[PDB]
């Protein structure tokens, strides 16, 4: 109740930092991790049906 | 190899062609100062060189260089031609006598049908009406003789040229005497016109001459129709059309439009196009109230004056440095053109007469002045600014657009599948939305907030629909042209217009492409593909082989038509097909319904839509696409991609086109290529060539933008707090807006409606500008109380048509291939039915049809381009045979009879008599026999109120005896009844072009390099043999069940392609790269035409009626039993069930006074006025919808199957329903289910709908049975009458009792309604009641038969195996697992 | 603990306020017409003054300024106005018609 | 009161998520397809994974 | 309960940071970054085939 809200606050601070960095810059591994994770979770849905045969 | 040229304009008039020809001939910039004139004078084409080297052209050029003649522009000579009145000779008598003869013959032909109708209703000329009309039409007026003479002259010139060019290739017509004053040098590649006493000369093209002839024909048709209608309305006010034009004003209108076209220039069409708005203003001044109509009037004036100022500016700019610099009139510089314009507009108002009928019919004026020359590079440059512009959006706008789209999709899934779509992102939803998700519900628009859409825009989906794995050959194959690859684009231009390095490059680089890549048409693009595979499109889409492809171009041809190579066109077609198949079910506002009654349906359902203020907004979405970008289209294309499990299939356009060069590939408009440059993406950007196109090509991706517009309308309705009812039909958006308001003190309903309209318009403008679409005051208007949609006008529930606009091009050889006689007759008849279906005039339509049928048969057969006069000799021998058989007195009477008997028996009447009362019928042979009986009553004096009697006049007995007596000669009974359940057999009916060209098409296809076509065409004949052998032992023949069996096999799809290919000219030269016709095709067509003309000699033999001393007795004769016997005897079959149906026009006797008999249907008039045309009543509009089957649908997941599989399942279910009595039904169904669907019968039976209807003879849904039975009157009028069919079920249950009978009650009601209409037309007073009493001699039982016999399983397997390349996708194990 | 919920709410409000003033410029051709440019995101005033300095090439910049600012230009104000005003040629033609 | 104050942070985070996802989707345009990085920004869908599975087993 | 309402917030925050990482990585002008992305995706595909073929 006391630590969790502070984790939320730190993540919001980092969010504001990256959002400034994005919106003022008019002129990779985390992204690949997320891509791989969700591609694996879609392949799992495919495998469930492939094994249900 | 013969060359047949056009007789009507089918194409565009080219600016660049005329520019190049005139620039080479006169040695200077003719129309513009383009690159076209420079390359034309540098390196002219060989046809231009041929035209310039003639002996008369050299003389005229010498005269021009000496300053003795002045050069002009084609609009000047159009104005000169349309006022040609040097018709003062012994030429003035011949034209008048010819027109008088045509009119007299048309009335004499119409007399027979008028007599028959007046006899049936109980109401050389035998009718008093037509005798008065003939007395009234004895002197044609001068304005009609003018246009008839002009059309005759121009048509003679064209016929002479076409005949002499068929006989000799490379023929130039040099004419000086046909049209006194003018000198024509006509050809296929140009036209030179010279006027000697005015000292004028012009150069134009062949299509411009065709346009001039079409103009003269259109004005002749207008004058004919208005003269006939005026003469009809002078005898009886209900007899003619609803319009009342005066032809002096119409002549003045033609003159002033020609003056506007001659005064400004080619640029003058832009002005006349604006006058449509002017007419709309004159309509609103009648229907709308002060504020709306004042707003529209001021906006219209502004639009017209802006158009005129822009026209003057562009005209003065274009002709500055050309050879036409001294052709600009002085009335343009000093501004005195306005006076002219004013007079024009005044005449239009004087022509309107302050009447909605005149003002609605007056829209023919915009098809009277011709067509402009379309400048191509300029049309390309006009949109380059709109599609290269940068757009700025707020992120909230895109979020809310995506959220509204996702809301529409969620709501559609919940309504259609009782299930939220599968989300992969439900973490992002809040609690109140998670409740909706897990309860499988959604909130309404009144409970929806703008934050909810931003929350919804974050959802991601799983695959819900599946892509087909094998290509459908019916959707990718058509009869159009295709774009070359990017390296072979320079083959779009003549070799003379290309530099030497480009020619060398083309010849050295055509050696590295396939034979299908070097193709210039779609059909041969597919036929020449020797590496074709049906899983090519699926692999292209899944692998994204269309992204970053170096073979991609966009080629424009003007109104612009764009094309690309074949792969990208495949991807485009597939994307639009998937949208039409899977998504348009969630957007019921998107329509594609263009039709006679469908538009009336839409306008009716639109009219059905402390105060409730209302308004309507009309918007034009033609230029809607140029404003779209990736950011605005693909936020929804992404949702569709996720729903189909693919990537960038619906986003292909804005990801591929920005990297392509857009080029104009007109033949006469090449670009300037700098030397040492061969690649197209390296050529300098110029007029007619550019890059970096953002925005989308017109026509491609239209459905995406339609559903996005609908989502934006939902967003606007949310933001504005009012109710919206929207309709989009193509490129026309209509919005009805409603809002509850509390009226102030003294405020009127009108002011509240106006305030609502203004605020809604502000909100619409702002919400459209938020996504980068800037609406103009020329594309949008507001109103309150007039229903307008797709150029169709309704007011107070009454519909106002524009028939004259659609009957403008009726003529000799319209809409045919190789000048077919039968198709031309059919098209004339079908085009003239519109003066009766919409115009509500039987007799005007009839007389116009007879005028042009007589002209086409008795005057234009002698002048056939390929069949010089053989068809006329055939006609004369048929007339002699008819005169001998029926004991007539002349060949004139013989032709009057020939023109009145149906085309089924070999006659020349394209319109059967039942179509004046109802539109559909279930049996053509009975209608043909009844029509023949009614027509022959004219000569035999039989009365159509008594019964069939034997009299001393035995013409009808002779006719019926020759109909039922002939020599049986059947051949291929079952496959023929499969492809047409109404066929006769034993050569008892006329043949059509498909049956004639089938074998030629298959032998041409047997040699195609594509194996999918070669094997099919090589197995065609044995497949036909097997298909005839399949269902031959099932003895009770049901041709509709045979049709159902036929449609469930791959030979159906194989035959679609052949029927499509057999509709081209020169079928033999498909793979020969030639535009000429082979003599074999001409011989085939000629012999077909001759056989079809002389059919009436074989059907009605003089041979003692085929040695039949027995004559037919008519005492107690049933026409429907005779029809059934005739149909069975021609196929040598014992019993054929479910095809014969009585005729309502023959079965029903018509009474007007009520009697104690108390029988038949009753039709009463609920209106209180004596007349009904142009009124509305308190009843519901009659739509004769038929009763389909009652069936229960099994419960499974349907979106797991495609559409072909869901269609095959319904077909197999109908087969299980119908042929459930045969002796080996289990093996039959097992074979079908395992051959076509891939599953066994036990597993497939779980997806079959179960039919609760017992009598399939009565309720079966096949493509060969009519689905609805409307009347021959407009819908708005059906509301004036009330019907009851109860007194007939009391007599039909004592004679049969609880049994099904063969009769359509829908057609009975339609007959009654059209009968009311026609009696009002002919008597000038509508009757109060009519009673229809049936003849029970014609009604029979309809009980489902018990089938006996065995189906041949071996032949079924042979048919399935020989055409295996057209089978649909099998249902997999992975798919059948998810089905449950 | 509300003293921390307040600092969470202020941060959420700041993020939602800086996300409701973002402006997106569509992708298009570069300067001197060679290549395509990416889509650009940036705060409202920065984008407006980038339009003024014509660093982003476009026509009709006045309505762009007046629409990125929640304001109504006079062109669009008469497009949706109560009454329509004629032109000199329009009044000439209207006098000729009456 | 803590739950009623936590049921608003969620509705603000959901709006932030919607806006940021719309931005992610609108930023993967023709230049991303030209450079070949668009599938790293939109995700791999059923058809590619099925092709990978068919070429794996 | 409160622990679930905090778990939801944690999940949403992680999703937001993921979206922001995507947006900021994809917005790199030099060609090096966009070449690294496609090389990493090349790798990922034929490393996913490994885990698929294993089981
Ligand atoms: C400003 N504005 C107009 O003046 C009109 C209305 C009248 N209209 C026609 C044209 N042809 C026919 C025919 N047949 C008919 Cl029946 C009406 C032309 C354009 C119009 C239509 C649409 Br959608 C959108 C805006 C406008």
B393, β-bridge pairs: C24
Q: What is the domain extent for residue E32?
A: 3-54
Q: Shortest CA distance to B813 belongs to which of B860, B854, B874, B868? A: B860
Number of residues that make up chain D: 57
- Taking only Cα atoms into account, the Rg of chain B, rounded to an integer number of angstroms, comes to 33
Q: CA-CA distance, B768 to B792, in Å (whole number)?
A: 26
Q: CA-CA distance, B921 to B911, in Å (whole number)?
A: 13
Q: Shortest CA distance to B771 belongs to which of B394, B1274, B1314? A: B394
Out of D16, D29, D34, whose CB is closest to C19? D16
Minimum distance, in Å, between the CA of residue B1223 and any CA atom of chain D: 45
Please report where in the chains the tokens 């009311």 appear, as a residue: B1316
Give the CB-side neighbour count of residue B164, counting CA atoms within 13 A.
14
Neighboring chain B residues of A53 at a CB cutoff of 8 Å: 1373-1374, 1377
Contact B1377 A53 (CB under 8 A): yes
Written as one string, the DSSP assignment of B50-116 is: HHHTSHHHHHHHHHHHTT-SEE--HHHHHHHHTT-----STHHHHHHHHHHHHHHHHHHHHHHHHHH
SS3 at position B1258:
coil
B740, β-bridge pairs: B612
Neighbours of B270 (CB within 10 A): 16
Exposure of B603 by Cβ count < 10 A (0-12 exposed, 13-18 middle, 19+ buried)? buried
Q: CA-CA distance, B628 to B654, in Å (whole number)?
A: 9
Number of domains in chain A: 1
Neighboring chain C residues of D19 at a CB cutoff of 8 Å: 19
Tell me, using a 6 A CB cutoff, whether residue B618 lines ligand 1.
yes
Q: CA-CA distance, B214 to B367, in Å (whole number)?
A: 10
Give the CB-side neighbour count of residue B132, counting CA atoms within 13 A.
9
Q: Shortest CA distance to B1177 belongs to which of B1272, B1273, B1276, B1274? A: B1276
Tell me, using a 6 A CB cutoff, whether residue B793 lines ligand 1.
yes
SS3 content of chain D, % helix, strand, coil (to 5): 80, 0, 20
Planar angle of CA B116, B120, B126, nearest 5 degrees = 35
Please tell me which chains touch C, using 3 or more CB pairs under 8 Å as the contact test: A, B, D
Q: CA-CA distance, B375 to B395, in Å (whole number)?
A: 40
Helices marked H in B1071-1166 — which ranges?
Answer: 1079-1099, 1104-1107, 1119-1129, 1144-1147
Rounded to the nearest 10 degrees, how much is the dihedral formed by the CA atoms of B489, B494, B500, B502? Answer: 0
Planar angle of CA B18, B19, B21, nearest 5 degrees = 65
Q: CA-CA distance, B69 to C41, in Å (whole number)?
A: 65
CB B1026 within 8 A of CB B1355: yes
Q: Is B765 on the interface with C (CB under 8 A)?
A: yes
CB B1335 within 8 A of CB B1292: no
Residue to substitute in B274, B275, B277 for testing ligand 1 pocket (most ligand atoms within 8 angstroms of CB):
B277
Instruction: Give whole-number Cα distances, B1037 to B286, B1136, B1261, in Å.
Output: 61, 5, 18
B1330, β-bridge pairs: B1163
Ligand 1 atom showing the smallest separation from residue B303 Cα: 1
The residue ranges of DSSP E strands in B507-666, in sequence order, are 554-557, 561-563, 590-591, 611-620, 662-664
- For residue B1103, the surrounding DSSP H or E stretch is none
Q: How far is CA B131 from the centre of its chain?
A: 38
Q: Shortest CA distance to B237 belongs to which of B1275, B917, B1170, B1314? A: B1170
Give the CB-side neighbour count of residue B156, counting CA atoms within 13 A.
13
φ, ψ at B1073 (rounded to 5°): 60, 40
Which residue has the CA at smallest separation from atom 3 of ligand 1? Answer: B277
Q: How far is CA B804 from the centre of its chain?
A: 17
Exposure of B886 by Cβ count < 10 A (0-12 exposed, 13-18 middle, 19+ buried)? middle
Structure token digits, residue D24? 């992610």
Neighboring chain B residues of A45 at a CB cutoff of 8 Å: 462
Mutual angle of helices B142-167 and B91-121, in 10-degree steps: 100
CB B1131 within 8 A of CB B973: yes
Mutual angle of helices B1225-1232 and B1353-1362, in 10-degree steps: 10
CB B1309 within 8 A of CB B1148: no
SS3 at position B686:
strand
Segment 6-35 of chain A within 8 Å of chain E by CB: 7-8, 11-12, 14-15, 18-19, 21-22, 25, 27-28, 30-32, 34-35
In a domain, C58, yes or no: yes
Structure token digits, residue D18? 């919607």
Structure token digits, residue C25? 């410029």
Mutant choice from A12, A39, A47, A50 vs D, greatest count of D C-beta within 10 A: A39
The residue ranges of DSSP E strands in B650-695, in sequence order, are 662-664, 689-690
> What sign for the dihedral angle of Cα B525, B530, B535, B539?
negative
Nearest CA in chain D to E55: D57
Minimum distance, in Å, between the CA of residue B502 and any CA atom of chain C: 24
Instruction: Give whole-number Cα distances, C52 to C23, C60, C66, in Å.
Output: 15, 11, 12
Instruction: Give whole-number Cα distances, B579 to B406, B629, B653, B695, B706, in Å.
Output: 15, 19, 15, 20, 11
Rounded to the nearest 10 degrees, how much is the dihedral formed by the CA atoms of B1320, B1325, B1326, B1328? Answer: -150
φ, ψ at A37 (rounded to 5°): -60, -50
Give the CB-side neighbour count of residue B1193, counting CA atoms within 13 A.
7
Q: Shortest CA distance to B1328 belongs to which of B1174, B1085, B1102, B1152? A: B1152
Written as one string, the DSSP assignment of B585-610 is: TS-TTEE---SHHHHHHHHHHHHT--
Nearest CA in chain A to E23: A22
Structure token digits, residue B912? 């059967």
Instruction: Give whole-number Cα distances, B1111 to B605, B1096, B1104, in Å.
Output: 57, 20, 11
Out of D32, D37, D52, whose CB is closest to E48? D52
- For residue B303, the surrounding DSSP H or E stretch is helix B290-318
Neighbours of B677 (CB within 10 A): 14
Q: Shortest CA distance to B274 belongs to which of B255, B260, B294, B254? A: B260
Which residue has the CA at smallest separation from atom 14 of ligand 1? Answer: B791
Q: Shortest CA distance to B171 belongs to which of B59, B6, B51? A: B51
Planar angle of CA B1005, B1006, B1007, nearest 5 degrees = 85
The residue ranges of DSSP E strands in B479-581, in sequence order, are 554-557, 561-563
Q: Shortest CA distance to B732 belongs to which of B635, B589, B634? A: B589
Q: CA-CA distance, B396 to B1007, in Å (whole number)?
A: 60
Q: CA-CA distance, B471 to D45, in Å (whole number)?
A: 22
Ligand 1 atom showing the smallest separation from residue B732 Cα: 23
Q: Residue B694 carries which DSSP code?
A: -
Sorted by sequence, the CB contacts under 8 Å of residue B507 that are 6+ apart come out as: none
> What sign for the dihedral angle of Cα B821, B827, B832, B833?
positive
φ, ψ at B548 (rounded to 5°): 60, 40
Tell me, using a 6 A CB cutoff, whether residue B620 lines ligand 1.
yes
Please report where in the chains the tokens 């509301």 appear, as a residue: B1279
Sorted by sequence, the CB contacts under 8 Å of residue B415 that are 6+ apart come out as: none
User: Is B1284 annotated as belonging to a binding site?
Assistant: no
Residues of B with a catalytic annotation lie at: 1258
CB B8 within 8 A of CB B815: no
Structure token digits, residue C75? 């062109």
In a domain, C33, yes or no: yes
CB B1184 within 8 A of CB B1307: yes
Instruction: Give whole-number Cα distances, B811 to B820, B842, B856, C46, in Å.
Output: 13, 20, 8, 66
Q: CA-CA distance, A44 to A41, in Å (whole number)?
A: 5
Tell me, using a 6 A CB cutoff, whether residue B722 lines ligand 1.
no
Buried b (16+ CB within 10 A) or exposed e, B969-985: eeeebbbbbbbebebbb
Sorted by sequence, the CB contacts under 8 Å of residue B714 that are 6+ apart come out as: B404, B407, B408, B445, B724
Instruction: Give whole-number Cα distances, B438 to B36, B456, D3, D4, D11, in Å.
Output: 68, 15, 21, 22, 18
Structure token digits, residue B852? 């042009």
- For residue B358, the surrounding DSSP H or E stretch is helix B356-361
Neighboring chain C residues of B631 at a CB cutoff of 8 Å: 24, 26-27, 39
Buried b (16+ CB within 10 A) or exposed e, B381-402: bebbeebbbbbbbbbbbbbbbb
Contact C42 A23 (CB under 8 A): yes
Structure token digits, residue B347? 């005449």
Instruction: Give whole-number Cα distances, B353 to B282, B476, B791, B1126, D26, in Å.
Output: 10, 51, 21, 56, 56
Planar angle of CA B380, B383, B384, nearest 5 degrees = 80
Please tell me which chains touch A, using 3 or more CB pairs under 8 Å as the contact test: B, C, D, E
Mutual angle of helices B91-121 and B924-940, in 10-degree steps: 110
CB B982 within 8 A of CB B924: yes
Please report where in the chains the tokens 């694996």 appear, as a residue: A40
Nearest CA in chain B to A51: B1374
Tell me, using a 6 A CB cutoff, whether residue B778 lines ligand 1.
yes
Neighboring chain C residues of A19 at a CB cutoff of 8 Å: 15, 18-19
Please report where in the chains the tokens 């002005």 appear, as a residue: B271
Sorted by sequence, the CB contacts under 8 Å of residue C2 that are 6+ apart come out as: D5
CB B100 within 8 A of CB B138: yes
Q: How far is CA A27 from the centre of its chain?
A: 25
Ligand 1 atom showing the smallest separation from residue B280 Cα: 7
Beta pairing, strands B70-71 & B200-204? parallel
Q: CA-CA distance, B220 to B147, in Å (whole number)?
A: 5
């Amino acid at each position: 109740i006391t630590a969790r809200l502070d984790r939320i606050d730190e993540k919001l601070s980092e969010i504001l930092g990256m959002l400034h960095t994005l919106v003022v810059a008019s002129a990779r591994e985390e992204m690949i991790e997320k891509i791989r994770t969700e591609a694996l979770m879609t392949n799992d849905r495919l495998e469930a049906m492939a094994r249900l045969r | 190899n013969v060359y047949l040229t056009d007789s009507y304009l089918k194409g565009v008039i080219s600016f660049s062609e005329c520019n190049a020809l005139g620039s080479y001939i006169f040695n200077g910039p003719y129309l513009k100062n383009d690159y076209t004139n420079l390359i034309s004078r540098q390196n002219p084409l060989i046809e231009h060189m041929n035209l310039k080297k003639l002996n008369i052209t050299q003389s005229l050029i010498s005269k021009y260089h000496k300053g003795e003649i002045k050069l002009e522009e084609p609009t000047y000579f159009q104005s000169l031609l349309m006022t040609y009145k040097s018709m003062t000779s012994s030429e003035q008598i011949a034209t008048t006598n010819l027109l008088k003869k045509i009119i007299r013959r048309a009335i004499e032909i119409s007399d027979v049908k008028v007599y028959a109708i007046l006899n049936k209703l109980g109401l050389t000329i035998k009718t008093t009406l037509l005798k008065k009309l003939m007395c009234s039409m004895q002197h044609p007026p001068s304005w009609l003789i003018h246009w008839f003479n002009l059309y005759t002259k121009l048509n003679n010139i064209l016929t002479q040229y076409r005949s002499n060019e068929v006989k000799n290739h490379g023929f130039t017509l040099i004419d000086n005497q046909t049209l006194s004053g003018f000198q024509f040098i006509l050809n296929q590649y140009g036209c030179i016109v010279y006027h000697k006493e005015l000292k004028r000369i012009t150069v134009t093209t062949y299509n411009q001459f065709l346009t001039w002839k079409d103009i003269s024909l259109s004005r002749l048709n207008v004058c004919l129709i208005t003269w006939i209608s005026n003469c009809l309305n002078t005898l009886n006010k209900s007899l003619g059309l609803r319009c009342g034009f005066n032809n002096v004003i119409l002549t003045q209108l033609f003159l002033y439009g020609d003056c506007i076209l001659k005064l400004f220039h080619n640029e003058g069409f832009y002005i006349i196009k604006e006058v449509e708005g002017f007419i709309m203003s004159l309509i609103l001044n009648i229907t709308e109230e002060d504020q709306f109509r004042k707003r529209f009037y001021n906006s219209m004036l502004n639009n017209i004056t802006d158009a005129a100022n822009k026209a003057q500016k562009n005209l003065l700019s274009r002709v500055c440095h050309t050879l036409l610099d001294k052709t600009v009139s002085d009335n343009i510089i000093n501004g005195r053109w306005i006076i002219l314009l004013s007079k024009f507009l005044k005449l239009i108002k004087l022509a309107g007469d302050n009447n909605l009928n005149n003002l609605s019919e007056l829209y023919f004026l915009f098809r009277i002045f011709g067509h402009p020359m379309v400048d191509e590079r300029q049309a390309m440059d006009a949109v380059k600014i709109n599609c290269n512009e940068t757009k700025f959006y707020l992120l909230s706008s895109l979020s809310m657009l995506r959220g509204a789209f996702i809301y529409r999709i969620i709501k559609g899934f919940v309504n259609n599948y009782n299930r939220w779509p599968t989300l992969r992102n439900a973490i992002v939803l809040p609690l109140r939305w998670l409740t909706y998700y897990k309860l499988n519900t959604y909130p309404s628009l009144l409970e929806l907030t703008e934050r909810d859409l931003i929350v919804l825009s974050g959802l991601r989906f799983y695959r819900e629909f599946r892509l087909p794995k094998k290509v459908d050959l019916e959707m990718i194959i058509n009869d159009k042209a295709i774009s070359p690859p990017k390296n072979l684009i320079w083959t779009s231009f003549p070799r003379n217009y290309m530099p030497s390095h480009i020619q060398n490059y083309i010849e050295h680089e055509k050696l590295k492409f396939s034979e299908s890549d070097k193709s210039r048409r779609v059909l041969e693009y597919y036929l020449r593909d020797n590496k074709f595979n049906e899983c090519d499109l699926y692999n292209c889409v899944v692998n994204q082989s269309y992204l970053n492809n170096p073979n991609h171009v966009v080629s424009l041809t003007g109104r612009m038509f764009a094309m690309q190579p074949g792969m990208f066109r495949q991807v485009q077609i597939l994307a639009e097909k998937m949208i039409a198949e899977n998504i348009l079910q969630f957007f019921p506002e998107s329509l594609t319904r263009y039709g006679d009654l469908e538009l009336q349906k839409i306008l009716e359902l639109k009219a059905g839509i402390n105060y409730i203020s209302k308004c309507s907004i009309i918007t034009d979405l033609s230029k809607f696409n140029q404003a779209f970008r990736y950011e605005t289209s693909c936020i929804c294309s992404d949702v569709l991609d996720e729903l189909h499990g693919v990537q960038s299939l619906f986003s292909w356009l804005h990801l591929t086109i920005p990297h392509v060069t857009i080029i104009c590939t007109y033949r006469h408009a090449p670009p300037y290529i700098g030397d040492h440059i061969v690649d197209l993406n390296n050529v300098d950007e110029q007029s007619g060539l550019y890059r970096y196109h953002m925005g989308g090509i017109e026509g491609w991706c239209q459905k995406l933008w339609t559903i996005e517009a609908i989502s934006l309308l939902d967003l606007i309705s949310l933001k504005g707090k009012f109710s919206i009812t929207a309709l989009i039909n193509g490129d026309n958006q209509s919005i009805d807006i409603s809002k509850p308001i509390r009226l102030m003190e003294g405020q009127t309903h009108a002011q509240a409606d106006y305030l609502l309209a203004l605020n809604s318009l502000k909100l619409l403008y702002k919400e459209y500008a938020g996504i980068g679409h800037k609406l103009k005051g020329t594309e949008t208007y507001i109103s309150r109380d007039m229903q307008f949609m797709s150029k169709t006008i309704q007011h107070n529930g009454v519909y106002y048509p524009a028939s004259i606009k659609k009957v403008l091009r009726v003529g000799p050889w319209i809409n045919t291939i190789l000048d077919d006689f039968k198709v031309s007759l059919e098209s004339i008849g079908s085009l003239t039915q519109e003066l009766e279906y919409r115009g509500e005039s039987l007799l005007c339509s009839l007389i116009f049809r007879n005028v042009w049928l007589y002209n086409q048969i008795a005057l234009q057969l002698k002048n056939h381009a390929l069949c010089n006069n053989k068809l006329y000799l055939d006609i004369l021998k048929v007339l002699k045979h008819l005169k001998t058989f029926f004991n007539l007195d002349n060949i004139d009477t013989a032709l009057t009879l020939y023109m009145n008997l149906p085309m089924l028996f070999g006659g020349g009447d394209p319109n059967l008599l039942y179509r004046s009362f109802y539109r559909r019928t279930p049996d053509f042979l009975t209608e043909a026999i009844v029509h023949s009986v009614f027509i022959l009553s004219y000569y035999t004096n039989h009365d159509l109120k008594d019964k069939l009697q034997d009299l001393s006049d035995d013409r009808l007995n002779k006719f019926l005896t020759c109909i039922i007596t002939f020599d049986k000669n059947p051949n291929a009974e079952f496959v023929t009844l499969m492809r047409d359940p109404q066929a006769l057999g034993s050569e008892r009916q006329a043949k059509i072009t498909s049956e004639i060209n089938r074998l030629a098409v298959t032998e041409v296809l047997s040699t195609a390099p594509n194996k999918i076509f070669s094997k099919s065409a090589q197995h065609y004949t044995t497949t036909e043999i097997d298909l005839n052998d399949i269902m031959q032992n099932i003895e009770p023949t049901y041709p509709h069940g045979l049709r159902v069996v036929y449609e469930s096999l791959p030979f159906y799809k194989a035959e679609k392609i052949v029927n499509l290919i057999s509709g081209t000219k020169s079928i033999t030269n498909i793979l020969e790269k030639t535009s000429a016709i082979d003599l074999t095709d001409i011989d085939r067509a000629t012999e077909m035409m001759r056989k079809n003309i002389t059919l009436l000699i074989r059907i009605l033999p003089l041979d003692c009626n085929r040695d039949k001393r027995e004559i037919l007795s008519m005492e107690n004769l049933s026409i429907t039993e005779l029809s059934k016997y005739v149909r069975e005897r021609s196929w040598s079959l014992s019993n054929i069930v479910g095809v014969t149906s009585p005729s309502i026009m023959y079965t029903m006797d018509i009474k007007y006074t009520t009697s104690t008999i108390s029988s038949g249907i009753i039709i009463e008039k609920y209106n209180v006025n004596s007349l009904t045309r142009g009124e509305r009543g308190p009843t519901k509009p009659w739509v004769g919808s038929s009763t389909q089957e009652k069936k229960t649908m099994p419960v499974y997941n349907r979106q797991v199957l495609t559409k072909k599989q869901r269609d095959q399942i319904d077909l197999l279910a109908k087969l299980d329903w119908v042929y459930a009595s045969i002796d080996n039904k289990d093996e039959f169904m097992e074979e079908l289910s395992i051959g076509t669907l891939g599953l066994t019968y036990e597993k497939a039976k779980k997806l079959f709908p179960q039919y609760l209807s017992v009598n399939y003879l009565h309720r079966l849904t096949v493509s060969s049975r009519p689905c609805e039975f409307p009347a021959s009157i407009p819908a708005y009028r059906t509301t004036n009458y009330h019907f009851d069919t109860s007194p007939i079920n009391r007599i039909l249950t004592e004679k049969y009792g609880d049994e099904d009978i063969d009769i359509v009650f829908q057609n009975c009601i339609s007959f009654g309604l059209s009968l009311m209409s026609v009696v009002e037309q002919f008597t000038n007073v509508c009757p109060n009641r009519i009673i229809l009493i049936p003849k029970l001699n014609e009604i029979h039982l309809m009980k489902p038969p018990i089938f006996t016999g065995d189906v041949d399983i071996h032949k079924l397997k042979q048919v399935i195996q020989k055409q295996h390349m057209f089978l649909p996708d099998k249902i997999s194990l992975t798919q059948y697992v998810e089905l449950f």
